[PDB]
Amino acid sequence: MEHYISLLVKSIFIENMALSFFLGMCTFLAVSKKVKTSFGLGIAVIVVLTISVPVNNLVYNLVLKPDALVEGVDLSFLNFITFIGVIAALVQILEMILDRFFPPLYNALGIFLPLITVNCAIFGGVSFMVQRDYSFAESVVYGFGSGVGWMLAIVALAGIREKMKYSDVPPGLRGLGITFITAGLMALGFMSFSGVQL
Amino acid sequence: MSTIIFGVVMFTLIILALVLVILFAKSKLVPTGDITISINGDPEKAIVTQPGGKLLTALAGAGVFVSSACGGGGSCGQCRVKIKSGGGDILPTELDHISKGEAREGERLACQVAVKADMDLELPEEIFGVKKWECTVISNDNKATFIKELKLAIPDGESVPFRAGGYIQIEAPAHHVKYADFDVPEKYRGDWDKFNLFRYESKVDEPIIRAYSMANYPEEFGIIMLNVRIATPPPNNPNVPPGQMSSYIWSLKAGDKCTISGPFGEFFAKDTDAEMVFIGGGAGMAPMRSHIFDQLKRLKSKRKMSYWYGARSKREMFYVEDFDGLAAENDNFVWHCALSDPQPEDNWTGYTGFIHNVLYENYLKDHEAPEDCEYYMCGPPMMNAAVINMLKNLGVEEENILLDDFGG
Amino acid sequence: KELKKSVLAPVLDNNPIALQVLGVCSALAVTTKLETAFVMTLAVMFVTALSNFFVSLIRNHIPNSVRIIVQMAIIASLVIVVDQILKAYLYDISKQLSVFVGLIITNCIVMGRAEAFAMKSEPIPSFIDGIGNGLGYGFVLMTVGFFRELLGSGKLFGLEVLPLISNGGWYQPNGLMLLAPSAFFLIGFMIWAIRTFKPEQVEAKE
Amino acid sequence: DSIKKTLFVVIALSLVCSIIVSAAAVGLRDKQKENAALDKQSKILQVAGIEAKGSKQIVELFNKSIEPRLVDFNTGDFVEGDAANYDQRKAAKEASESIKLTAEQDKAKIQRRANVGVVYLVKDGDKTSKVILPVHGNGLWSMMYAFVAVETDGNTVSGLTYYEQGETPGLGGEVENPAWRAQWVGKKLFDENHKPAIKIVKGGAPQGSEHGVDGLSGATLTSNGVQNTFDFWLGDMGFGPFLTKVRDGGL
Amino acid sequence: GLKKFLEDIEHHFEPGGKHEKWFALYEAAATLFYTPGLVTKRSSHVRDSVDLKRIMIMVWLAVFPAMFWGMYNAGGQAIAALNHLYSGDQLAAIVAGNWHYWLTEMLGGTMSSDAGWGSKMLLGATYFLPIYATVFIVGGFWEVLFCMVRKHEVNEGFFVTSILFALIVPPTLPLWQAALGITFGVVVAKEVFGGTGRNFLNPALAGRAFLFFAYPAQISGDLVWTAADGYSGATALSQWAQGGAGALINNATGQTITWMDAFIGNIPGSIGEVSTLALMIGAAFIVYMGIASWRIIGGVMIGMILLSTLFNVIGSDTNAMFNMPWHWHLVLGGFAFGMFFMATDPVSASFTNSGKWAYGILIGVMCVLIRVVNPAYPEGMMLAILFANLFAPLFDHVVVERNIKRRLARYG
Amino acid sequence: MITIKKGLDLPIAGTPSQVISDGKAIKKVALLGEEYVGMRPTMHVRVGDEVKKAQILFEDKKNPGVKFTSPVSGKVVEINRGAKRVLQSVVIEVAGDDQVTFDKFEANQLASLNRDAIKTQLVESGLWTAFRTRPFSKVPAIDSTSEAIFVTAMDTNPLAAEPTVVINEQSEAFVAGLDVLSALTTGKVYVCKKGTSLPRSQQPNVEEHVFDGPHPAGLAGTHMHFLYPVSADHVAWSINYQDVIAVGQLFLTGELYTQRVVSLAGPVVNKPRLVRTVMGASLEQLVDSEIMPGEVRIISGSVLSGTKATGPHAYLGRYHLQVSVLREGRDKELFGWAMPGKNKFSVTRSFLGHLFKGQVYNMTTTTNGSDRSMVPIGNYEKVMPLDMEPTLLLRDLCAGDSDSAVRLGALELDEEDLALCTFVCPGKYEYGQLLRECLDKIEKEG
Ligand SMILES: Cc1cc2nc3c(=O)[nH]c(=O)nc-3n(C[C@H](O)[C@H](O)[C@H](O)COP(=O)(O)OP(=O)(O)OC[C@H]3O[C@@H](n4cnc5c(N)ncnc54)[C@H](O)[C@@H]3O)c2cc1C
Ligand SMILES: CCCCCCCC[C@H]1O[C@H]1C/C=C/C=C\[C@H](O)CC(=O)NC1=C[C@](C)(CC)OC1=O
Ligand SMILES: Cc1cc2nc3c(=O)[nH]c(=O)nc-3n(C[C@H](O)[C@H](O)[C@H](O)COP(=O)(O)O)c2cc1C
Ligand code: FES
Ligand code: FES
Ligand SMILES: [Ca+2]
């Protein structure tokens, strides 16, 4: 239990997918207007990551790993296509569930569900799992922790942007520039965990 | 070599398996059924529709005169209906045309409401009463340097159901027309040397649609009369094409085919005792004529009316005979006009400058209670600005100012 | 003739990163060295242009159900070939780029353009649009990389221009220019300048 | 569209893409391997003091002047195997090819040591002039790897090179500074008692000393890492027995 | 007459005047010397006497004992280290080579081992004052530039930012580094957001973080905390992290660092942080006046005590930071300074009474956590405060959502 | 009992002596058009017209059927209009004693009258404007009802009159008005008061609730928050004790009762006391020879929430029961912001004044400082007793985010509820204006 707790804590804080690895920045910057919208997007990302990482682990270990399928034959060059296809299929099925017969929560999220496929955070998490050679349980835990960390970062940014309703940003910086500066400051704050080796 | 074969087969199988999984999941997670679009409606009025797409597409396919104006453009905002069951959630882009006080009653824009499940429609005030007619030109007579009046003949002894100030829709096919085809008299045609409009021509390769207001009044039975302005290129870059259907309508003459549809209007007059003030310029005389004739002759009530008009020069004013006859038999009405640029042949002796300044300085400056009157307005853009500004500086509230612009 | 207009508009008028928010992760990552930034720009130009070309070439027959699957197939194939070529001929830069070569697949510019333009246009126009978007992306990346590399190591393309105190010179490098937070500030100030010279891009006040 | 046409289109596209992808991925494998090997060969040639530039010159001089060998740490004598392709960094983490270190044994904080390691002899005809030892240990931010070239007396250092580190460029990154790496030449690894004697001394070494080298200025959590690296890799768990064998006779 | 002069020169800055573009500075001087003389015009025809000028001058006066003791202690530590290292002609040659030392000697002081508090504080002055002047001038340039270009009223708050930034840096900071740090803190962290009352980060710590991560070699290590040429000595937190309480020794004098020494401030470090007693004396006044948040201070203390006691309980046989008690965490590093003067910035804290407790608890927990389990940095007060600045809005949001649910239940 | 713990009793000088005396003779009265929220007048009189008491003067366009009537018999002399011809005041010159009369009933018949008859009589007499609706503080529509009518029998405003002294003279009228309100309400009538005794109505649905503590313990907003929280679908009506006396007199004698008992007090008033006056009296004539020499400000109402009575507005407000006069603070001090103020008031403890407990201040109209942004020192939480987030709500109002202000609790407030927050603001903001702006938007959009 202690090992998995350490892994989850590391994934959430010491290797924050958004503010330590800087992946997913397009949607992280664009959809940070409202706290609840960011919350829904973060929960969707959590589901996608936690379902994608273990399946990719299984596929890689059973087929793509060198000598896994046939001795002397390695198909490691199919890693990118396999990962992207699995992620796309999972996201398509989840959207088919959401914008349809189970829970009409699709609406508010709108056009970002299709963009969850090209969210660099999920692909980077799968790549990091492949590099680190995790087990299946370690996979599940790492995916869940990475999703939780990304959701936390996005929610914090949304809260800050909601607080900025009182601000007086110059006209040129109003919009994207001030958000970029705010994200940089948030990363500066998150640099407190750099030296920790959990 | 073996690695190549293994990679090919593995690529193919992985992609095929993912595609098969997606298709199988679709068969369960999408209904793939059929639903009926319910209407305020009688039980057979419903429309059968497989789910998918916007709601307005099924109403248009069923031949219903669903509300729409300005050819759509995603900005007209006239595509609103009321839905009682199944309306779903409002799309944020609707808020620019629907207020918070109106959205809570279930009013939705037909463009945005997707037909994804069964719904019930309370179509407003029986839109089914709208019709379209095939029609013949009675006359197309010029009246000003850029204004012409079109007279129209309803078939089978019918008369369009309308109230004063309403408008009808007009459509034109793919057509080519040139300014040399026009039949404008020289008295009006001499002023076109400003841009040498005789050089100009226009053409379109697919049908278009616009709307026009009606210069007649409800008890002017059997005909629809319109006032049309020849849309000319703007002066800053006058090399651009002229008005596509303005030119087409300008070229028609007596006996030619025409079609009309969509009798509509939100410019109806309020039913009160208080005084009425009509103000307009240029081509805006048609709704004013409609309102004044309708009130004087149909309603017959003894209210107080006034009409103010602005124009460029004296050769731009018409309907003087009609307004003078109305005034000669009704003391409740009076008409005044002013000229921005009275020309040497005008021999003008009346008020000059823009009509808002004339109105304020001569009538409203001394008015006992200007906020109690009703102001109907339609005219050039700077009339559209200045009249509203001057009225609002006198304390006149919005609910007493009614504006009918020419579609922005 | 709209060739030049299409190639040049994304540079300033419709920039991939500074108007649309598309292509930001790689901009934050690979812009600590001009060689990596330049190679990344070339790779993105290549991939976007060819993916647009092919997707537009098969736009009429693509099944609607699995269009994203086939589009990802095209892009992933192109990126895999690019990765093989890089590891074969530019091993050093490839070892430096690391995961971000594979992440070209999830670079939002490629799919944004493939969906918005390639599905609706002809092959040659799609190719030209991909070239233009890649040029704008490269403009942003090289502008950031210049400042970051110069002020963080005293170098340009590995060429010493500011002698370092550690090497016996006078310049002391700025350590923050080698960390991710610097890219955010640089991009923000660049957006500020772009919108100062192009006021029509200013966002309306909420 | 029909499911028949959907599957046909997907299958055809998959075949077309996979053909070229697999062909490219299989045609360049040998060149990728060559690049990977030459990167390592260049570093070894550099630490050996042999100038070389270009793939041709590197791959010629490495073959004609260097000779990889396998060494058993527990006994400090040579072992049979394909030394030129041995992957120590992988054999160290595999359960059957390595051991788990104990807390009092793991001075370098590596947590595992491979059963057999690789060393590179430097040749002059058939005479051995130097032996290069790959060592590593944990710094403050990363795991630091290095090559140390030791003469044939088993005591004298001929050069040091840190070829992989992730410390701060200005503080801990000085392990790659040529001025600091030039201090290691001529230093003695062992004292009279044939015990580890390398000392990273804080504040600078007393000039003329045969064991002390200057610590990294403002960087002690990294100098400690270097000290632990050498303390572990000159001990019984490292190249201790092998170096004693070299000293009393070998190569 | 200053009063008549200020009101007979105003026409040069009125619209259409010879100096219409300098009205900001004119009004700043005029309303500094005299009160505006304005009146209420809409409602609440009576107003409280408090204003931002007093709110800021009180905080500026609160750090005066800390400033003076830091000056004295910097001078004393430098003199002790110099006399420990050198002697006689070598010491004379060292003194003649540094302008701090030979200026101290010229102005009447002595650098010998028997120097008094006057010479010690003079030597500390020759270090503190240039940094403060550079910080103030450089930051005020940006403040005035932004406020003039945007046509705002130049306001206070930089008055406190400059001094707090100048008191939290080692006595040996290069002046150009100080200028860069204050530029970053004022511009990037505050002014781009609209100025005073409209940022979300702490402007003082934002610049210090810039220096910390951009030039770590001048704000860390052994060579920066005692302004003695050639002296290299560790400080309390580093010595504890190395060898527990048995490693707390003052090399310059060979004496043991005791809790009483740490509490008074007889230790090296940043200029103004050292004196916990002086910081407590200063903070008591502004907490009594209602300017600082006792809720935030109590939350910080609660978090510190809880986490430090948990570490003491679970223990560790290798990490010596696991046995440092709460009363030792209190007196070392910049914990007291940060808690009293930098964790209480009203604009960067939570705007809810319930959120302030959580904000302080998070700050304390993060400070102790960085100190103990992060090997790279011996202290983490500024990093903890910057980290909690990100999550204060979330605490406010949670409290507000609970309040809104209560409202919908028709009980609020 | 409800005990308010957070608030502020302002220690301004010159408190009235709670004894009623006759005031200066009044020759002019007026109705002020801008003190009625959302009113758009339709004038029924023009200069030179002669009016009877309770005769209509104008109607509200936006509130159909509501009639505003003359407080006295006389002649219209002025109809003042400001920017955009907005009505400022209709001034009547007192002459004669003619009046419009109505029906009268016995004291024991009032509890069982018909609601429609009560509403008809009130609207016709023009006394219907005494009521106000929370939210939006507007006159109720004549076709609407409410389940909670709040009577305010306490007054905690600075220098305010003591309601008990006034009520003791009109016990029968007060009880009759309470009975009429009980008949008029669908639910309950809440009589909010202090701990002392008042005449009691015997009706089962009239309740007495005792509130304790400093200001704002005496505000109808606080009473509504603590007894009947209001929202978009739960509106409550607010009336004060003197208007209840007027209602009782109306339904007992058939005549509009326009007398008042107001508190004339302030630092510059020679003899603070209660004075008998008439509705909408001329303050300039009321304060004649009552003030010390110099430049002063006359306020219709409290110094916390009142209208500067100069020019066309120099008349007593409809909902105001006091007149406050204080000096104009236009002096400049050398380093005044840095002085150890013994004579300076503050909620914070930065000045020496708080050490002198029981001290009384000669406050003026100075703004002690310049305008700044909001630095949340925490002053609002010391003076807002309601269950709200003061800092966040005020920041929402400043930013103009009406949608979130409604959630945070804007609908429950009035301009008078934020007077203390405006008072204790170090940034010198004025929150009543912002609250009215946001409420205007909320009302307009529906
Ligand atoms: C309810 C309603 C009632 C109306 N009633 C009347 C009425 O009674 N009488 C009347 O005359 N109109 C009326 N209109 C206006 C009319 O319906 C159309 O708005 C329009 O005036 C008809 O012109 P068109 O469609 O032929 O030309 P359009 O093609 O619609 O006009 C296009 C214009 O844009 C210009 N243009 C095109 N490209 C450029 C360019 N690059 N740069 C600059 N300029 C350019 C063209 O030269 C031309 O002037 C009414 C509109 C509405 C909505
Ligand atoms: C661009 C034009 C040329 C540049 C200008 C030339 C260089 C400018 C630079 O030397 C600085 C001065 C600027 C300070 C700015 C801001 C300060 O925050 C203002 C300030 O402390 N105000 C006050 C402090 C006290 C005394 C107590 C509260 O009262 C106040 O009002
Ligand atoms: C407000 C404040 C915040 C500080 N924050 C840090 C920090 O985050 N990291 C750090 O290494 N030192 C920080 N310091 C400096 C240390 O407290 C201390 O002065 C320095 O590390 C040398 O003393 P020490 O090593 O014994 O802690 C801070 C100082 C102050 C006054
Ligand atoms: S580039 Fe857009 S999510 Fe990474
Ligand atoms: S097209 Fe008319 S509102 Fe959408
Ligand atoms: Ca090993």
From Swiss-Prot, chain B:
Consequence of changing residue 111 to A: Loss of the 2Fe-2S center, but does not affect flavin content. Exhibits very low NADH:quinone oxidoreductase activity
Cofactor-binding details, from the entry: Binds 1 [2Fe-2S] cluster.
Ranges for domain 2Fe-2S ferredoxin-type: 33-127
Keyword Amino-acid biosynthesis among record annotations: no
InterPro entries for this protein: 2Fe-2S_ferredoxin-like_sf, 2Fe-2S_ferredoxin-type, Beta-grasp_dom_sf, Cbr1-like_FAD-bd_dom, FAD-bd_FR_type, FNR_nucleotide-bd, NqrF, OxRdtase_FAD/NAD-bd
Main location (coarse class): membrane
GO molecular function, one term: oxidoreductase activity, acting on NAD(P)H, quinone or similar compound as acceptor
One GO term (biological process): sodium ion transport
Necessary cofactors: [2Fe-2S] cluster; FAD
Function noted in UniProt: NQR complex catalyzes the reduction of ubiquinone-1 to ubiquinol by two successive reactions, coupled with the transport of Na(+) ions from the cytoplasm to the periplasm. The first step is catalyzed by NqrF, which accepts electrons from NADH and reduces ubiquinone-1 to ubisemiquinone by a one-electron transfer pathway.
Similarity comment text for this entry: Belongs to the NqrF family.
Name listed for the protein in its UniProt record: Na(+)-translocating NADH-quinone reductase subunit F
UniProtKB/Swiss-Prot annotation, chain C:
GO biological process: sodium ion transport
Cellular component per GO, a single term: plasma membrane
UniProt-annotated location(s): Cell inner membrane
Superkingdom of source: Bacteria
Entry's transmembrane regions: 38-58, 68-88, 99-119, 127-147, 174-194
Enzyme Commission designation: 7.2.1.1
Reaction catalysis annotation: a ubiquinone + n Na(+)(in) + NADH + H(+) = a ubiquinol + n Na(+)(out) + NAD(+)
Swiss-Prot/TrEMBL keywords: Cell inner membrane, Cell membrane, Ion transport, Membrane, NAD, Sodium, Sodium transport, Translocase, Transmembrane, Transmembrane helix, Transport, Ubiquinone
Protein's membrane topology: Multi-pass membrane protein
Primary location group: membrane
InterPro entries: NqrD, NqrDE/RnfAE
One of the record's GO molecular function terms: oxidoreductase activity, acting on NAD(P)H, quinone or similar compound as acceptor
Family: Belongs to the NqrDE/RnfAE family.
Subunit: Composed of six subunits; NqrA, NqrB, NqrC, NqrD, NqrE and NqrF.
Function per UniProt: NQR complex catalyzes the reduction of ubiquinone-1 to ubiquinol by two successive reactions, coupled with the transport of Na(+) ions from the cytoplasm to the periplasm. NqrA to NqrE are probably involved in the second step, the conversion of ubisemiquinone to ubiquinol.
NCBIfam families linked to this entry: nqrD, PRK09292.1, PRK12405.1
Protein name (database record): Na(+)-translocating NADH-quinone reductase subunit D
Source organism of the structure: Vibrio cholerae serotype O1 (strain ATCC 39541 / Classical Ogawa 395 / O395)
Originating gene: nqrD
Swiss-Prot record, chain D:
Cofactors: FMN
Pfam name, any one: FMN_bind
Keywords from the UniProt entry: Cell inner membrane, Cell membrane, Flavoprotein, FMN, Ion transport, Membrane, NAD, Phosphoprotein, Sodium, Sodium transport, Translocase, Transmembrane, Transmembrane helix, Transport, Ubiquinone
Topology within the bilayer: Single-pass membrane protein
Main location: membrane
EC number: 7.2.1.1
Source organism, top-level taxon: Bacteria
Gene Ontology molecular function: any one: oxidoreductase activity, acting on NAD(P)H, quinone or similar compound as acceptor
Subcellular location per the Swiss-Prot or TrEMBL entry: Cell inner membrane
Annotated transmembrane regions: 7-27
Effect the entry attributes to changing residue 220 to L: Loss of FMN binding
InterPro entries in alphabetical order: FMN-bd (IPR007329), NqrC (IPR010204)
One GO CC term on file: plasma membrane
Single GO biological process annotation from the record: sodium ion transport
Annotated SMART domains: FMN_bind
FMN phosphoryl threonine sites (modified residues): 220
Alphabetized HAMAP family for the sequence: NqrC
Family statement drawn from the similarity comment of this UniProt entry: Belongs to the NqrC family.
Name under which the protein is recorded: Na(+)-translocating NADH-quinone reductase subunit C
Organism in which the protein naturally occurs: Vibrio cholerae serotype O1 (strain ATCC 39541 / Classical Ogawa 395 / O395)
Lineage of the species this protein comes from: Bacteria, Pseudomonadati, Pseudomonadota, Gammaproteobacteria, Vibrionales
Curated annotation (Swiss-Prot), chain E:
GO CC terms of this entry: plasma membrane
UniProt-reported outcome of changing residue 225 to L: Decreases riboflavin content
Superkingdom: Bacteria
Residues found modified as FMN phosphoryl threonine: 235
Recorded topology in the membrane: Multi-pass membrane protein
Entry cofactors: riboflavin; FMN
Full protein name: Na(+)-translocating NADH-quinone reductase subunit B
Species this protein is from: Vibrio cholerae serotype O1 (strain ATCC 39541 / Classical Ogawa 395 / O395)
Gene: nqrB
